[PDB]
Amino acid sequence: IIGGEFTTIENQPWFAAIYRRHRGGSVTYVCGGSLISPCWVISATHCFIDYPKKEDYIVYLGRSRLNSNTQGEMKFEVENLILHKDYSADTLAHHNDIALLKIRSKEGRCAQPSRTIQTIALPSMYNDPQFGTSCEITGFGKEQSTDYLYPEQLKMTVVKLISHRECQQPHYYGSEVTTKMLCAADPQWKTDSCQGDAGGPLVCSLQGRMTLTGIVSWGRGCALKDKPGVYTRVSHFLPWIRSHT
Ligand SMILES: N=C(N)Nc1ccc(C(=O)Oc2ccc3cc(C(=N)N)ccc3c2)cc1
């Protein structure tokens, strides 16, 4: 996350931290995700497509720090790693950039709500907040494009939903942005998602509830003028999601 504020998991209790264990025993951070039901985390296919072996991934819930334990965190194995059959990468854009991770503890449990762990609602089919709506993003991603380290403490910020009209302009992303994506940026371009925030939530109030409106997917740089964050448009993927859950 560029700009915004350090937070704790209690402020984003659906946030999932996804790591990969390496042959040698090193475990490193992959991507964010979102708890959408007790057994299911949603994230971005591009996080996993290069190494789609469920056995080498760990999911934490209730975790506020990247490389140390949080009291109230819970560790899960990936019972099922479901990538989108129609994922593809352009020069910038990722298409159908959505993934499901079916979680289970070695004890065989799915998630239990607590002070640090809660599910996030899905939107209804094709239902999105109006353009100019303020939404929250969260992640362990870089605090500056040019950084080589990730922050140790979870961050969040607020961005505004941008019209496709505005996002499709040629000095923005022109062609690369489709109707299965949502753009969101700061009107002063001072705060954004960045590398390491992929798969993380874009959360909006919609039809009365905090809703998972988007999944952090891609962008040219981070907090660059006329280069918004691009998100997977969750509202378009409900039948895909229901088919697995
Ligand atoms: N094996 C993996 N998990 N790889 C991997 C997985 C994910 C990423 C990653 O996080 O890629 C990006 C990079 C830049 C981004 C910029 C913006 C933006 N301006 N809002 C948004 C998202 C971005 C995402 C990188 C690598």
Side-chain angles (χ1 to χ4, degrees):
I1 303 299
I2 318 299
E5 308 286 331
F6 288 101
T7 188
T8 62
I9 196 59
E10 296 90 336
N11 286 330
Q12 291 286 328
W14 43 81
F15 183 76
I18 307 174
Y19 302 77
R20 182 177 155 195
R21 351 162 129 104
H22 293 110
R23 31 288 129 99
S26 60
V27 164
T28 69
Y29 189 67
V30 173
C31 274
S34 303
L35 195 65
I36 56 162
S37 65
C39 303
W40 289 97
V41 165
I42 206 159
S43 188
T45 276
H46 85 250
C47 294
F48 307 102
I49 191 72
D50 291 336
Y51 299 88
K53 182 166 175 188
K54 69 201 173 88
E55 290 85 6
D56 290 359
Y57 296 92
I58 313 175
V59 181
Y60 287 82
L61 295 179
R63 180 149 169 142
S64 288
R65 297 187 57 85
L66 225 213
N67 294 299
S68 55
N69 310 282
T70 295
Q71 216 154 29
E73 81 188 8
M74 300 290 151
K75 183 176 183 184
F76 307 85
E77 298 301 320
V78 185
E79 192 170 350
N80 232 227
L81 178 61
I82 309 170
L83 303 187
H84 204 292
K85 61 201 128 61
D86 284 322
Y87 171 79
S88 69
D90 244 316
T91 329
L92 254 75
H94 304 254
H95 307 265
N96 301 298
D97 194 13
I98 189 168
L100 287 164
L101 287 90
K102 197 183 171 178
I103 55 167
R104 76 168 174 205
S105 76
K106 281 190 170 140
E107 313 99 87
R109 296 188 185 198
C110 298
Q112 304 184 248
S114 71
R115 189 158 37 69
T116 51
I117 302 167
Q118 298 284 331
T119 56
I120 181 76
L122 292 176
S124 63
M125 291 188 46
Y126 292 93
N127 193 25
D128 294 286
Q130 270 179 14
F131 79 64
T133 304
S134 290
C135 297
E136 314 190 343
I137 51 173
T138 308
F140 281 122
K142 291 181 191 175
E143 296 199 73
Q144 310 177 302
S145 268
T146 58
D147 286 354
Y148 279 100
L149 299 165
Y150 291 152
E152 227 9 83
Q153 188 72 28
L154 191 63
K155 295 191 69 191
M156 67 79 61
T157 196
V158 172
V159 290
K160 286 197 170 196
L161 264 33
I162 290 181
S163 71
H164 284 287
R165 269 276 162 285
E166 175 181 351
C167 210
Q168 301 270 36
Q169 299 183 104
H171 57 302
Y172 282 47
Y173 289 127
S175 298
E176 281 286 279
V177 174
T178 76
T179 59
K180 308 179 59 168
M181 315 181 188
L182 289 173
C183 299
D186 184 50
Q188 296 281 350
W189 307 102
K190 298 315 184 182
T191 187
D192 205 353
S193 45
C194 197
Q195 178 184 340
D197 290 321
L202 173 72
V203 168
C204 308
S205 210
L206 178 62
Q207 317 287 118
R209 215 165 281 179
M210 288 299 261
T211 297
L212 183 73
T213 294
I215 301 162
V216 177
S217 179
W218 63 274
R220 170 67 270 280
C222 308
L224 275 190
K225 202 195 173 240
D226 294 310
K227 306 307 161 166
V230 193
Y231 298 82
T232 306
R233 185 179 185 170
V234 171
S235 66
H236 286 27
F237 290 85
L238 291 200
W240 190 82
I241 296 160
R242 273 160 194 286
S243 80
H244 299 113
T245 72

